């Protein structure tokens with residue numbers, strides 16, 4: 001869907017921006033600094049679920065640029081493992097949110113955040 | 127969820143970027159220049175549905191900036207009418223996509239695009 005590689009870069013960066021907001025806005029809730037409303041969090045994690053499927057198709061052939069490392073493309077199976085594992089982490093977060101289970105939410109949130117960081121550390125330029 | 131107004135601006139702009147991609151990538155399909163796969167379009171319109179609910183909460187009190195006009199905030203009921211009418215247009219598009227009805231899709235796509243433009247013309251700086 002991208003006329004030029006620059007359009008794929010713009011897309012995936014914007015998807016990252018929105019994920020960061022929908023993930024990070026739950027930090028105070030996980031920490032107990034903000035109240036836990038199970039329905040609010042369930043709805044927010046749904047949004048995050050949708051968003052977290054979006055970046056990967058915007059690292060398609062010819063879309064090199066931004067702060068994306070070349071290794072994304074030369075090691076396609078390995079990058080794919082990391083995005084699929086991340087989306088698995090999001091499923092765990094969704095399950096926790098859908099159940100209304102705050103302890104589960106805390107734990108799953110930590111594992112999601114670790115997965116974001118592990119991919120950035122390997123595949124995003126500093 | 128925004129630490130500073132600039133964070134709300136960044137969010138709503140990124141939501142616009144992603145909507146433009148998920149809306150605009152259907153133009154060739156509507157025009158018949160690309161094939162119509164009902165399941166593909168149904169899934170894409172779902173994504174667009176989720177995205178098209180996101181900008182409005184990022185025009186919250188104190189979030190003035192970017193290319194957003196002041197009138198957004200001073201005329202709150204009227205801006206709200208335009209975003210609610212837009213989301214109604216998206217419901218029509220979803221219904222068309224879910225039914226697999228290309229003629230309905232064409233018509234609903236045109237009305238969505240008109241609604242994007244009408245809001246930008248009134249509320250986005252040039």
Ligand code: HEC
Nearest residue numbers: 013016017019020023066067068082083086116119123124
């Ligand atoms: C690899 C499998 C990733 C996972 C998992 C996550 N991110 Fe990511 N992210 C990735 C890359 C390769 C890039 C660079 C894209 C480019 O072309 O520049 C990014 C970028 C971001 C950004 C910055 C966007 C920008 O302003 O330029 C953000 C804010 C971001 N990513 C957030 C984010 C979050 C919160 C994630 C987990 C919920 C996450 N990413 C996972 C690769 C990968």
Ligand code: HEC
Nearest residue numbers: 139142143145146149192193194208209212242245249250
């Ligand atoms: C008002 C009810 C709007 C409707 C309906 C749509 N958009 Fe919008 N959009 C609106 C404003 C006020 C702004 C400016 C935000 C700012 O603070 O700068 C925007 C911006 C965009 C952008 C540009 C994002 C950027 O790169 O800075 C895009 C690409 C965009 N909008 C797309 C878009 C599409 C495709 C829409 C219909 C599907 C749509 N918008 C509707 C206000 C409103």
